[PDB]
Design a binder for this molecule. Structure first.
Ligand SMILES: NC(=O)C1=CN([C@@H]2O[C@H](COP(=O)(O)OP(=O)(O)OC[C@H]3O[C@@H](n4cnc5c(N)ncnc54)[C@H](OP(=O)(O)O)[C@@H]3O)[C@@H](O)[C@H]2O)C=CC1
Ligand SMILES: NC(=O)C1=CN([C@@H]2O[C@H](COP(=O)(O)OP(=O)(O)OC[C@H]3O[C@@H](n4cnc5c(N)ncnc54)[C@H](OP(=O)(O)O)[C@@H]3O)[C@@H](O)[C@H]2O)C=CC1
Ligand SMILES: COc1cc([C@H]2OC[C@H]3[C@@H]2CO[C@@H]3c2ccc(O)c(OC)c2)ccc1O
Ligand SMILES: COc1cc([C@H]2OC[C@H]3[C@@H]2CO[C@@H]3c2ccc(O)c(OC)c2)ccc1O
Lengths: 309, 309
C-alpha cells in the first residue's frame, strides 16, 4: 500500500487530489498547519478528509523538523502549493519541503505543485507572469540537485478557469450574449476537468512508467480551439453568441498599467490562446496521462459545459 | 410543494439551509449574485446546488427590481446574510431585501438572518458586539413596518464555534492540554449542530404553528455548562485537561484596546458564558424547535465531538 502525503490538502486542486488518493486506495496523509485558526472552511475540510479515512499530520513550514517528521511517514509526497497571483503565489515555500525531503531520505517520489503550463518551455514569458515559471523551475532545480525522484504533472487548463467561462477573463460562468474571441480563435488549447487531473495524479504517483518523467495531461477529445469551445456552448443552448475578435496588440495594450495579478492573467492567456503553448509541441502516448491511464473516462467539455445549463 | 428562496445561499449557515430545504422537499431557489467574480468556491457551490435540484435565480442587491423579480417566484424567503464581525457583518443590507419583499406583495413568510442570540433580549450589550443586536432589531422593525409575516429563528450556539473548540477563542479545535474555563464553568449554554439548525429552519418555515413567532432552538440534551462540555471531551479522550478559571473582570480586562472583531467576540462570549443569556429565561414547547419537530434526532455533543478524536 502506497503512503502519500498531500501538502496543500485544502487547496483548490489539493483537496481534489486528497480525495482521489483515497479513492485510488492509497494510505493518504494530509498536512494540517496550525495557523488555520478561525478559517472554519479549512478546519471542516480536514474533518471531512478524516471521515474518508485520511490521517492528519500536524506540521508547519516554519518548523523544519516537523516537515521532516511528516515526510518520514510516507512513500510519496504530493505538493499542491499555491501558484496563482490573484489567489496567492507561494511556490518557493516548497523549498523548505524539498529540504525536509532531502533530510528524511525515505521519500520514493515527490510531485511538486506544477499542474499547468510546462515551466522549462516558457523561458520567453515576460514578467510578472514569468514568476510562475521561474519559481517552478527553481523548485525543479532543488529537487534534482537533491537527487529526489520526481514526477511533473503538466499540460492542461483547469476547466473551471478556462472552459466554464468560454475563456472570458474575470468571470467563471458562460456569458449571456457576447463573447470575446482571442485572435481568430483557431489556436488549439488543452482542457481538463480538475477531478480528472486529480485522478491522473493519484494514478501516476506510484507508476514506474512516470518515475523521473514529465507526464502530460492532454486528453485528445479535450484539445479544442476557443471557437470550438464556444460552438459547443452555442449548440447546447441553441443560441449563437455575438463574437468580437480581439487582436494580439489590443489584448496586450496598456498591460503595463494594470494591477499585477491581472497582468499575470493576461500574460498567461496570451501564451495559451495566442501562442498556443499547450499544443505547439507533440507528446508521446508513453508520457500522456489519458493513454497511460485509459480507465479514466475523462469528462469531455460538452459534458462539462452541460453543468452550466 | 413550498417554494423557498435562500438569499445568502453560499454562506456558512446559508449553504446548510439550502441543502436542508432540498432534503425537506421544498422547491428550492437560490439567489446567485452577479458580483461573484473569480470566487470559484461560490461558483462551484451553486453548481453543486443545481445538481441537487435547486433552481438558480439571478439578482443583485444593487438592482431593486432584480430582487423584486426573485421574491415574486417563491412563497417563503430565508436570509442567511452575514453577521460575524471577523467574517463580515452586513445585516443591514437585508433592508433592501425587505423593501423588495414589500413591493412584491406575494411572500407568505420571511425568515431574516438571526440564528443566534435573541436580539430584543440583548438591549444591555455594549459596543461593538452590540451592533449585531441593533441591526437585527432594525431589520425586525422594518419587517413589521412592512407587514411581512415572519419567523425569527434563535437560541443556540453553532456547534463549530463553541463546542468543537471547548469554547476556546481564536481556535476551532479542542486544545491539547490546557483549557480556559469561564468563571466556574457552571453557566448553562445551548449548543446545536448547524445541520440540525438548518433542518429545523427548513421544517419551521412553512409551519402554521410558527407564523409570526420566535422559534427557539434549545434541544434539551444540548443545554450544557462549559464544564459539562469539557467533561464530555475528557471522557471521549480518557485524559483530564488542565483547567484555568478566568474571572469576569480578567476576561474583559483592556477589552477597549483590542481589534474590533475580537472585542465583539469577547462581548458575545461574556453574554453567553458569564451572563447565561441563552438559558436565563424559559421557553414553552410551543416555541422550541426540538419539541416542535421531534422527528429531528438532533446530534448530541458527545457524538459531535467524536469528529475531533
Ligand atoms: N489551469 C491550470 O492549469 C491551473 C494551474 N494551477 C496550478 O495548481 C497549483 C495549485 O494552485 P491552487 O490549487 O489554486 O492553490 P491554492 O491557492 O488553492 O493554495 C493551495 C495551498 O497552498 C497552501 N499555501 C498557500 N500559501 C501557503 C504558505 N505560505 N505556506 C504554506 N502553505 C501555503 C495552502 O496549504 P493548506 O491546505 O495547508 O492550507 C493552500 O491550500 C499551482 O501550481 C497552480 O499554479 C492552478 C490554477 C489553474
Ligand atoms: N453561534 C451562532 O449562533 C452563530 C450565529 N451566526 C449568525 O448566522 C447568520 C449568518 O452568518 P454566517 O453564516 O456566518 O454568514 P457568512 O459570513 O457566511 O455570509 C453569509 C452570506 O452573506 C451574503 N453577504 C455578505 N455580504 C453581502 C453583501 N454586501 N451583499 C449581499 N450579500 C452579502 C453572502 O451571500 P451570497 O452567498 O449570495 O454571496 C454570504 O454567503 C448571521 O446573522 C450570524 O450572526 C453566525 C455564526 C455563529
Ligand atoms: C494553464 O496553465 C496555468 C493556468 C493558470 C491559471 O491559474 C489560473 C488563472 C491563471 C491565469 O488563468 C486564471 C486566471 C487569471 C486571471 C483571470 O482573469 C482569469 O479569469 C478566468 C483566470 C496558472 C498557471 C498555469 O500554468
Ligand atoms: C450565539 O449567538 C451568536 C454567536 C455569534 C458568533 O458567530 C460566531 C462568533 C460569534 C462570536 O462567536 C464566533 C466568535 C468570535 C470570536 C472568536 O474568537 C471566536 O472563537 C472561536 C468565535 C454571532 C452572533 C450570535 O447571535
Amino acid at each position: 500500500k502506497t503512503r502519500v502525503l498531500v501538502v496543500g490538502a485544502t487547496g483548490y486542486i489539493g483537496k481534489r487530489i486528497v480525495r482521489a488518493c483515497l479513492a485510488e486506495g492509497h494510505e493518504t496523509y494530509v498536512l494540517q498547519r496550525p495557523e488555520i485558526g478561525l478559517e472554519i472552511e479549512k478546519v471542516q475540510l480536514f474533518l471531512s478528509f478524516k471521515k474518508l479515512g485520511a490521517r492528519i499530520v500536524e506540521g508547519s513550514f516554519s518548523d523544519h523538523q516537523s516537515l521532516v517528521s511528516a515526510v518520514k511517514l510516507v512513500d510519496v509526497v504530493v505538493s499542491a502549493m499555491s501558484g496563482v497571483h490573484f489567489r496567492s503565489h507561494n511556490i518557493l515555500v516548497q523549498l523548505k519541503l524539498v529540504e525536509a525531503i532531502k533530510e528524511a531520505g525515505n521519500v520514493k517520489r515527490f510531485l511538486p505543485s506544477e499542474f499547468g503550463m510546462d515551466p522549462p518551455r516558457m523561458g520567453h514569458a515576460l514578467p510578472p507572469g514569468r514568476e510562475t515559471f521561474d519559481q517552478k523551475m527553481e523548485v525543479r532545480q532543488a529537487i534534482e540537485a537533491a537527487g529526489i525522484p520526481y514526477t511533473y504533472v503538466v499540460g492542461a487548463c483547469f476547466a473551471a478557469y478556462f472552459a466554464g467561462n468560454l475563456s472570458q477573463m474575470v468571470t467563471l460562468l458562460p456569458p449571456k450574449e457576447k463573447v470575446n474571441i482571442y485572435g481568430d480563435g483557431n489556436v488549439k488549447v488543452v482542457f481538463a476537468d480538475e477531478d480528472d487531473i486529480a485522478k491522473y495524479t493519484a494514478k501516476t504517483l506510484n507508476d514506474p512508467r512516470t518515475l523521473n518523467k514529465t507526464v502530460n495531461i492532454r486528453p485528445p477529445d479535450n484539445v479544442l480551439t476557443q471557437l470550438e469551445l464556444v460552438q459547443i456552448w452555442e449548440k447546447l443552448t441553441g443560441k449563437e453568441l455575438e463574437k468580437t475578435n480581439i487582436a494580439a496588440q489590443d489584448f496586450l495594450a496598456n498591460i503595463e498599467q494594470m494591477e499585477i495579478p491581472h497582468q499575470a492573467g493576461i500574460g498567461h492567456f496570451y501564451h495559451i490562446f495566442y501562442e498556443g503553448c499547450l499544443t505547439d509541441h507533440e507528446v508521446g502516448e508513453d508520457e500522456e496521462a489519458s493513454s497511460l491511464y485509459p480507465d479514466v473516462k475523462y469528462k469531455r467539455m460538452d459534458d462539462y459545459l452541460r453543468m452550466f445549463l
